[PDB]
Amino acid sequence: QPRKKRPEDFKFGKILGEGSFSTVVLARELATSREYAIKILEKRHIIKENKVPYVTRERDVMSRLDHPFFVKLYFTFQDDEKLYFGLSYAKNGELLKYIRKIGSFDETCTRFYTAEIVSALEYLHGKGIIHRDLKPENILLNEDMHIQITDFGTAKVLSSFVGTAQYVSPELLTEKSACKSSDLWALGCIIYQLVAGLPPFRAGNEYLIFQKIIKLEYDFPEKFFPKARDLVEKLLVLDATKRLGCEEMEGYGPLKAHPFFESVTWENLHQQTPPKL
């Protein structure tokens, strides 16, 4: 393998994202002129707040991913104060940006992007990995407008944590337990948001959102594609063992065979040209 990279190998540019424990900065490697999104984490702050297990798990999960619809981890290094993770740069930003820009997706764009997300989840879940915080903010778009799912700090590897309120599955609120089917619940919220323009469970504060989620209190706009509504109803199901895609429903085959996806070719989505948004 190549000798470890270091900060001096790059010219750092603009900040791409900021979290409580990390900052992602666009960087151009001098020897190659390649651009990477470098996630930078301060060792002191991680240790102080007991985040070592999360940072360790994020790195370890990313190392295992080798699929076009996921962030790729190219390299890591550290200096005295900071860890550096070299990630694929998703030039077009967040799916959420496009939702806002255009309001809501037509049926062809909903179908295509939903199919990429389902195909990515099939790969992720086949590895026994659960994302636990899936949402349009961490579904990025590459230069070619294919998805690149990111943000694995909170993932779980199948042999505690609660993600973003609007996408939280009822079982987390009633058990503190997660599973693959929790990602599928989030998928149901995302589809709904692509079609309606907004997430299904909304309210003034988290407490009230949580109330709506555990009561399955949401509804569909009249202009909701009927087949997409049927799919969303089969995903937003309080009983986690009855969600389309979960093991107790015999997995991804029946999900991928849903009528909403009739015209989808599953085998080579990454090779297909995405519908203009």
Ligand X SMILES: O=c1nc[nH]c2ccccc12
Catalytic residue numbers, as ranges:
133
Phi, psi of 227 (to 5 degrees): -65, -35
Residues in Cβ contact with 245 at an 8 Å cutoff, skipping those fewer than 6 apart: 118, 121, 180, 181, 184, 187, 235, 251, 252, 254, 255
Out of 38, 41, 71, 228, name the contact with ligand X by CB under 6 A. 71
- Least CB distance from residue 190 to ligand X, whole Å? 18
> What is the length of the chain?
277
Out of 24, 65, 249, 264, name the contact with ligand X by CB under 6 A. 24
Cα distances (angstroms) measured from residue 146 to each of 5, 33, 91, 114, 266 = 28, 23, 11, 11, 14
135 is an annotated ligand-binding site residue: no
How would you label 43-65 residue by residue, b for 16+ Cβ within 10 Å and e otherwise?
eeebeeeebeebbebbbebbeeb
Region from 87-95, 107-115, 152-160, 239-247 binding ligand X, contact rule CB under 6 A: 87-95
- Least CB distance from residue 39 to ligand X, whole Å? 7
Out of 38, 41, 88, 118, name the contact with ligand X by CB under 6 A. 88
Give, as one character, the DSSP assignment of residue 70. B
- Least CB distance from residue 110 to ligand X, whole Å? 24
Report the residue number, 111 or 146, with the smaller CB distance to ligand X.
146
What is the contact mask toward ligand X in residues 131 to 170, using x (rule: CB under 6 A)? ---------x---------x--------------------
**Contacts to ligand X by CB under 6 A:** 16-17, 24, 37, 71, 87-90, 140, 150
